[PDB]
Amino acid sequence: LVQAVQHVVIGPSSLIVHFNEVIGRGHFGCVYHGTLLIHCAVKSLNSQFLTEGIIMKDFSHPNVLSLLGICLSPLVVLPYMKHGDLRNFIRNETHNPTVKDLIGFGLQVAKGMKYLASKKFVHRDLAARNCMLDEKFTVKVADFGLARDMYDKEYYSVHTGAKLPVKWMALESLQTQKFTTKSDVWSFGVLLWELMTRGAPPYPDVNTFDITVYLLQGRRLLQPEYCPDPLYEVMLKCWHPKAEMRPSFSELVSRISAIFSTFIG
Numbered sequence: 328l329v330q331a332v333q334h335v336v337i338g339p340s341s342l343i344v345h346f347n348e349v350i351g352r353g354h355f356g357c358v359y360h361g362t363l364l365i366h367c368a369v370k371s372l373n374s375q376f377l378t379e380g381i382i383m384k385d386f387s388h389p390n391v392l393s394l395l396g397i398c399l400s401p402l403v404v405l406p407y408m409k410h411g412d413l414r415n416f417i418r419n420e421t422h423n424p425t426v427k428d429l430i431g432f433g434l435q436v437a438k439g440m441k442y443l444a445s446k447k448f449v450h451r452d453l454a455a456r457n458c459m460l461d462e463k464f465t466v467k468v469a470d471f472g473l474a475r476d477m478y479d480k481e482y483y484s485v486h487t488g489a490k491l492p493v494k495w496m497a498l499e500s501l502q503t504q505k506f507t508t509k510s511d512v513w514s515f516g517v518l519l520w521e522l523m524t525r526g527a528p529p530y531p532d533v534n535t536f537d538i539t540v541y542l543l544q545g546r547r548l549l550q551p552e553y554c555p556d557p558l559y560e561v562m563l564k565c566w567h568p569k570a571e572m573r574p575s576f577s578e579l580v581s582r583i584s585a586i587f588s589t590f591i592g
């Protein structure tokens with residue numbers, strides 16, 4: 328059996344978990360502050376989940392959340408992310424990110440997704456709520472592999488039994504329930520829109536499963552007030568009806584780099 332957990336196991340003598348310090352919550356379990364013998368986040372789980380998520384051990388990229396290990400109700404040990412999720416970060420009105428900052432965040436997400444696409448890995452739930460910020464404000468694509476969960480149940484709906492983030496899903500995934508790198512690209516465009524609105528909910532006048540017909544009618548998210556025309560063009564390409572006509576993440580990194588660079592920090 329693929330218990331490659333073996334290589335990833337943190338012995339019981341190497342992890343102190345602080346169960347009184349809940350720093351997060353998912354459908355599968357809580358996240359606790361821990362001490363790895365460094366600071367860390369420790370996600371509780373409550374076979375197929377582990378085997379399908381354990382690939383993340385091989386991943387290392389600055390804009391992708393890494394795995395520190397598994398301790399054994401097994402515990403997934405992840406890097407501490409001081410500034411929480413990206414969506415809450417930008418909704419905090421005590422801080423005013425610049426437009427350059429916000430595009431910067433999307434550029435970092437694009438870089439993380441470029442890496443994951445180059446490893447032939449499909450995220451399936453890319454969204455601002457699922458990216459995390461560390462102490463240096465580096466954005467990490469998260470909520471995948473052993474970190475995979477629903478961290479905000481408002482935005483997931485059932486339909487097979489799966490809980491689907493319908494307002495981030497590509498048109499073909501809404502029809503077929505199948506995901507691909509190119510459906511991640513669709514989601515990426517929605518995340519960009521989230522960034523430019525500082526975390527407004529998409530399609531707020533559309534009841535969850537009325538989204539499919541809305542998109543079939545030839546309709547899309549409207550251009551945010553602070554979103555520059557070239558970036559809205561990127562968003563619209565990301566939501567092309569034909570998957571293969573959507574840009575690659577490599578093209579997105581390049582084009583968003585250019586747009587980012589035209590702004591004053």
Ligand SMILES: CCN(CC)CCCOC(=O)Nc1cccc(CN2N=C(c3ccc(OC)c(OC)c3)CSC2=O)c1
Pocket residue numbers: 350351358367368392405406407408409410411412415456457458459469470471474478479
């Ligand atoms: C008191 C809360 N934080 C300050 C703002 C403490 C900072 C330290 O906490 C961590 O390091 N957490 C940590 C690290 C690695 C992975 C994960 C799991 N996960 N968490 C997600 C998440 C986290 C907080 C949220 O909102 C509260 C939220 O909302 C929709 C979603 C989605 S993406 C992901 O993979 C969590």
